[PDB]
Structures are given as structure tokens and as C-alpha cells.
């Protein structure tokens, strides 16, 4: 629920519209008015501030760190995580089994490769 | 003698010790971690 | 004496029924992998193949209801931010 | 529904690892802990 509880007499469906002339007057009287005094951000019509990532207290730490590390990227539409090692889930080609490698090296090679 | 009973467990299966790199451990951290995301995508989305 | 053979004899070299008891060369293992690996390759080539016509004949006969479940999504997303600007455009209207 | 009798104790508390901080470590444990799974079901049924 909204918490404006300030009363001006304007009746838009009985009152004349008024003209830009008459619009730009009022707008012009309203920035003086805000240029008059200061504006209070302790107001009780506006809402509490947003917590920060450490003291929200359903963010993670690793939530954070990840929020972290989006607010640091320029692009952060754009911004992509690291991939995981798509490539070993591909088809193992055959290892270059040299003649100066070894036996245990080309078995552990070969067994590596069986793995995949 | 009658309500208390023993509990064996089978060797069957190689012993898993309870450490972190478990697939259902894995698991359980992403869907807390999924959890918590949602917990604060919703007050975010309540206080926007 | 089953987990004594599977902790001496490796478990990958324990899989393969070329492994003989009495072949203690290592260029007929280096060998018998080397065929279980080119099997295995083979294998893996033909089910990839499979897999491939399998996704292939799945997405020619689901293409459609893919992209009508993604104008639908299209369409409640729309329509969640219209109902959401209508509803704080009725708060307003109330208000005022 | 009757011959299973559920045991109630405390919650294991697994220690979370300081390499398991991040999303992308977290799921490279995963896939890891996955395809070596995958590798001893497949040598399971090789050996069978």
C-alpha cells in the first residue's frame, strides 16, 4: 500500500487541462521550492535502502561473490561464466604414440584414452 | 532385548567417505544454493 | 581374493578379457589396449551417429511445439509486465 | 511401509571446502565426480 497521504485540490475530469505555458510555470515554482531547502533522505515516506550483498540474509557468501563479480564486468548482460571441459565428452582420436616413449607412458596413455 | 535392534551395514558397495565432491552432497549444495538465490530474488522483487 | 585382484590388477586393465594371467609383456597389453581403444572409438563413432539421427528426427518432428512453447513464454512473460504496470496504474488510480 | 523404520539423529554436517567457494568450481567437482561415476559403472559392467 502506498503511504501518500497528501491532499491537493485538483480535479482533473472537472478543471480546466491546463496549457505548457501554465505547466512549465508549475514546474519551474516546484524546482524553486526544491531549490528552497534541502532534500531529506531520512524521509518516512521513502523506504528503507537496499541492504548490501554481506548483510542480506538470504544472499550467500558465494552469492555475493558471484553478484561481486558481475557488478565487475562491464558488460554485465553480456557477461559469461567460464565453461567446463565440454572436450573430454567428445570422441578420443588416437594418441600419437611416439618411439622413443616408453612403455609405462604409452600404457598410461592408452589406458587415459580407453577412459575417455 | 526386543526393542532395541541391530544395525548391520552391507560391504557390498565400496566405502564413500562423506566429503563435499559426493554427486548427492553436489546436489544438496546447488539446491540450497538455488534456494537461497530464490529467498533473495524474492525480497528483491518484493521490495522493487 | 576378488578385491585383492581388483586392487592389484587395475580396474581398467581387469575390464578388458584380453588380459591374460601368463602374458607378463608389456607390448601385448600396450597391443590389447590399443584394440579395446579402436573398439571402443568405433563404438562410440556408431552411437554417436545413432544419437545424432535419433536428435535429428526428434527435433524435425518437435520444431513446432518447440516454438509454439516459446511464443507462449513470449506471450505470459508480456503479459506478467502488463499485468504489473496495470496494477500499479490501479493503485495510482485509487490513490488519486 | 512397515518393514522400514526411519532413524532419527542428528544432521550430518558435511565441512564445506574452501575450493568449493565459487559456482564454477562447485560444478566442475560435479562433472568430475559424474564421469567418474560413469567410468566405474562402465568398468562395473565390463568386469561383469
Keep these: ?116 | 532385548e526386543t526393542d532395541l535392534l541391530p544395525i548391520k551395514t552391507s560391504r557390498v558397495v565400496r566405502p564413500r567417505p562423506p566429503n563435499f565432491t559426493s554427486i548427492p552432497s553436489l546436489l544438496k549444495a546447488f539446491q540450497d544454493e538455488w534456494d537461497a538465490l530464490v529467498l533473495e530474488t524474492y525480497t528483491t522483487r518484493e521490495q522493487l | 581374493i576378488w578385491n585383492r585382484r581388483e586392487e592389484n590388477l587395475n580396474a581398467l586393465r581387469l575390464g578388458l578379457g584380453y588380459y591374460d594371467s601368463d602374458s607378463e609383456d608389456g607390448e601385448d597389453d600396450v597391443a590389447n589396449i590399443r584394440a579395446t581403444l579402436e573398439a571402443a572409438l568405433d563404438r562410440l563413432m556408431a552411437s554417436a551417429e545413432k544419437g545424432n539421427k535419433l536428435e535429428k528426427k526428434l527435433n524435425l518432428h518437435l520444431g513446432g511445439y518447440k516454438n509454439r512453447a516459446e511464443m507462449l513464454r513470449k506471450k505470459l512473460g508480456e503479459a506478467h509486465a502488463a499485468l504489473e504496470k496495470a496494477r500499479n496504474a490501479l493503485a495510482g488510480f485509487q490513490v488519486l
Design chain 1, 1 to 116: 500500500m502506498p503511504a501518500i497521504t497528501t491532499v491537493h485540490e485538483s480535479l482533473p475530469y472537472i478543471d480546466p487541462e491546463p496549457t505548457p505555458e501554465q505547466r512549465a510555470a508549475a514546474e519551474a515554482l516546484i524546482a524553486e521550492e526544491r531549490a528552497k531547502v534541502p532534500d531529506d533522505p531520512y524521509h518516512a515516506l521513502l523506504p528503507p535502502p537496499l541492504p548490501p550483498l554481506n548483510e542480506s540474509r538470504h544472499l550467500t557468501p558465494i552469492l555475493q561473490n558471484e553478484l561481486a563479480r558481475l557488478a565487475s564486468s562491464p558488460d554485465p548482460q553480456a557477461a559469461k561464466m567460464d565453461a567446463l571441459d565440454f572436450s573430454r565428452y567428445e570422441a578420443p582420436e588416437m594418441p600419437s604414440i611416439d618411439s622413443s616413449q616408453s612403455l609405462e607412458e604409452t600404457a598410461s596413455q592408452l589406458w587415459e584414452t580407453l577412459k575417455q
